[PDB]
């Protein structure tokens, strides 16, 4: 059966996202592989990323949803939990992933991470340092990066 067990779930999630999208994010395959999706997230209003559209790539494992998907940013973003390669630290993407967790919930968690970053347990130590020591500087830099790369 190869990975059809995962493809059933992936198609069901795509149908669910298409019928009722959150209107602040989108997701779906734009290429030739059902395992590879593109997603878009609108920057939250309560964050310096307001007005930016951030693109993400989703790579589904062959045994989805037993293993979590590989979600990575493709638009450059200034955030202490997202590195220059787009990797995201969410604690539900490799360590506490459980079935019945949907891609939509992952997008909502990423949006929440954008709204309220995590200084401790960082992925980029320098951005976390600037975030902890100067909030105005962090917000200005994040706004500049959002205007440059997500607008």
């Amino acid at each position: 059966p190869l990975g059809s067990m995962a493809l059933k779930r992936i198609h069901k999630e795509l149908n669910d996202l298409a019928r009722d999208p959150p209107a602040q994010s989108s997701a779906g395959p734009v290429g030739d592989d059902m395992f590879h999706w593109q997603a878009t997230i609108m920057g939250p209003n309560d964050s310096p990323y307001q007005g930016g559209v951030f693109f993400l790539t989703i790579h589904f494992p062959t045994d989805y949803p037993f293993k979590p998907p590989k979600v990575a940013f493709t638009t450059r973003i200034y955030h202490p939990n997202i590195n220059s390669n787009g990797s995201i630290c969410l604690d539900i993407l490799r360590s506490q992933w459980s079935p019945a967790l949907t891609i939509s919930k992952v997008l909502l968690s990423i949006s929440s991470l954008l709204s309220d970053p995590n200084p401790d347990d960082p992925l980029v130590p320098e951005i976390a340092r600037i975030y902890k020591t100067d909030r105005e500087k962090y917000n200005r830099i994040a706004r500049e990066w959002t205007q440059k790369y997500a607008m």
Binding site: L2, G3, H11, L14, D32
Partner: protein, 77 residues
């Protein structure tokens, strides 16, 4: 039982799942598309990896595997 499950993306936004074999011809896939969605085979144009899938050739000839998405164009009608 080594059948591969592929998808056909239409311009309406839907994705039609098809359980096929690598040796299935492109016209066989078009017949399945007609059965599931009603579009006549002679008005279907299938695109995969930037190639127009010609009749008589098989899915394996285009490296179509499990989870492949083929774009369907409903033209000439």
């Amino acid at each position: 039982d080594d059948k591969m499950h592929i998808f056909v993306r239409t311009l309406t936004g839907t994705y039609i799942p098809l359980e096929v074999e690598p040796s299935d011809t492109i016209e066989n896939v078009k017949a399945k598309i007609q059965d599931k969605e009603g579009i006549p085979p002679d008005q279907q144009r299938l695109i995969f990896a930037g190639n127009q899938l010609e009749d008589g050739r098989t899915l394996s000839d285009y490296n179509i595997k499990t989870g492949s998405i083929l774009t369907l164009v409903w033209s000439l009608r």
